């Protein structure tokens, strides 16, 4: 793939390379010239040439026809395909321009986290964004910081020579949702394993079955990464993951450690955690109760925890859904009509 997604290469005999935007094991996105399109940059995903990948993205084109038409204006911010085409055996989606990934943003300012002002916006809208997947029978299944992008350029940036970086302020927070190659409609065959690590929620973890929740779930863990900088659950470990989770929210419902075949996990009712080895006390000291992770005691701060708590909630038949939480006190402040 590296042979066929080169500075200046044509594709389509219209789209001129100019620059990668990213890259994964999907395959990469470039930014091109549309020379059809009066020099429109666009974007084009250029799949990996492998059964896995060929069929997520045949799935992500129908996903993506059904969401585009039924938002032609994308009033609920999921990214607009623009068609796609064959180059060299490989699948090419061709996508509107957006703008750095909420990943990227963070990461490039040495793991500085949003302004909390930016993150009520930013929640609301993936929030507004992955509940329209839910109305529409869909569960995105894959929601992290890489796929939420930020719809423009929004932001200033200064090299700073104390630190040898470039810092990057933003200016206008709005997003959209990409990566509709794994979104799973209520009717179709579910896969076991979905979620990357840190976005993963306990049902998934446990292969007790999954839903709408398991995107409610990896929100909260956004949420949090957001206001922190980093995530709370920072492990590539299943086991350590839920001792993690035990210590930061408290325990698990016996009910779901019960039910589930992932018994590997545990011992009688309780994870089969050794709290007293070396990587137990390591995972104690890492972490601690959520609300204690709060950088003040200010109500508005009180008010994002409550929803993080609440999409954090354990049991998928009890956590919150995006419907309740689009109408959360933490978003009364975008609602302020005097
Ligand atoms: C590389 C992120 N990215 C996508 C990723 C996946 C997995 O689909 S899709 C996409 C569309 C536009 C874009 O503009 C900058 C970026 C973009």
Same mark, same amino acid.
């Given at each position: 793939?590296?042979?066929?997604?080169?500075?200046?290469?044509?594709?389509?005999?219209?789209?001129? *390379?100019?620059?990668?935007? =990213?890259?994964?094991?999907?395959?990469?996105?470039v930014?091109?010239?549309?020379? &059809?399109?009066?020099?429109?940059?666009?974007?084009?995903?250029?799949?990996?040439?492998?059964?896995?990948?060929?069929? %997520?993205?045949?799935?992500?084109?129908?996903?993506?026809?059904?969401?585009?038409?039924?938002?032609?204006?994308?009033?609920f911010?999921?990214?607009?395909?623009?068609?796609?085409?064959?180059?060299?055996?490989?699948?090419c989606?061709?996508?509107?321009?957006?703008?750095?990934?909420?990943?990227?943003?963070?990461?490039?300012?040495?793991?500085? @986290?949003?302004?909390?002002?930016?993150?009520?916006?930013?929640?609301?809208?993936?929030?507004?964004?992955?509940?329209?997947?839910?109305?529409?029978?869909?569960?995105?299944?894959?929601?992290?910081?890489?796929?939420?992008?930020?719809?423009?350029?929004?932001?200033?940036?200064?090299?700073?020579?104390?630190?040898?970086?470039?810092?990057?302020?933003?200016?206008?927070?709005?997003?959209?949702? !990409?990566?509709?190659?794994?979104?799973?409609?209520?009717?179709?065959?579910?896969?076991?394993?979905?979620?990357?690590? $840190?976005?993963?929620?306990?049902?998934? *973890?446990?292969?007790?079955?999954?839903?709408?929740?398991?995107?409610?779930?990896?929100? =909260?863990?956004?949420?949090?990464?957001?206001?922190?900088?980093?995530?709370?659950? @920072?492990? $590539?470990?299943?086991?350590?993951?839920? %001792?993690?989770?035990?210590?930061?929210?408290?325990?698990?419902?016996?009910?779901?450690?019960?039910?589930?075949?992932?018994?590997?996990?545990?011992?009688?009712d309780?994870?089969?955690?050794?709290?007293?080895?070396?990587?137990?006390?390591?995972?104690?000291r %890492?972490?601690?109760?959520?609300?204690?992770?709060?950088?003040?005691?200010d !109500?508005?701060?009180?008010?994002?925890?409550?929803?993080?708590?609440?999409?954090?909630?354990?049991?998928?038949?009890?956590?919150?859904? #995006?419907?309740?939480? #689009?109408?959360?006190?933490?978003?009364?402040?975008? &609602?302020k009509?005097?």
């Open positions: 793939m590296h042979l066929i997604c080169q500075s200046g290469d044509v594709l389509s005999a219209r789209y001129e *390379i100019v620059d990668t935007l =990213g890259e994964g094991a999907f395959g990469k996105v930014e091109c010239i549309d020379h &059809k399109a009066g020099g429109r940059h666009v974007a084009v995903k250029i799949v990996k040439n492998v059964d896995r990948y060929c069929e %997520a993205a045949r799935s992500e084109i129908q996903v993506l026809e059904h969401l585009n038409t039924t938002d032609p204006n994308s009033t911010r999921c990214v607009q395909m623009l068609e796609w085409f064959e180059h060299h055996g490989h699948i989606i061709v996508f509107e321009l957006l703008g750095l990934s909420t990943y990227d943003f963070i990461k490039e300012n040495g793991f500085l @986290p949003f302004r909390l002002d930016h993150i009520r916006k930013m929640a609301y809208q993936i929030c507004k964004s992955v509940n329209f997947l839910h109305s529409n029978k869909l569960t995105h299944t894959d929601l992290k910081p890489e796929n939420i992008l930020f719809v423009q350029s929004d932001y200033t940036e200064a090299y700073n020579p104390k630190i040898k970086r470039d810092e990057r302020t933003l200016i206008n927070p709005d997003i959209k949702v !990409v990566d509709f190659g794994s979104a799973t409609y209520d009717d179709e065959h579910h896969s076991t394993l979905v979620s990357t690590r $840190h976005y993963r929620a306990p049902e998934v *973890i446990l292969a007790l079955g999954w839903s709408q929740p398991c995107d409610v779930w990896s929100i =909260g863990c956004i949420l949090i990464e957001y206001y922190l900088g980093f995530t709370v659950f @920072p492990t $590539h470990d299943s086991k350590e993951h839920l %001792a993690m989770m035990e210590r930061i929210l408290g325990p698990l419902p016996k009910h779901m450690i019960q039910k589930t075949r992932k018994r590997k996990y545990f011992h009688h309780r994870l089969d955690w050794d709290e007293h080895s070396s990587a137990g006390r390591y995972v104690s %890492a972490c601690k109760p959520l609300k204690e992770f709060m950088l003040s005691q !109500v508005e701060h009180e008010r994002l925890f409550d929803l993080i708590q609440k999409m954090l909630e354990y049991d998928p038949a009890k956590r919150i859904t #995006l419907r309740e939480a #689009l109408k959360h006190p933490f978003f009364d402040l975008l &609602k009509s005097i």
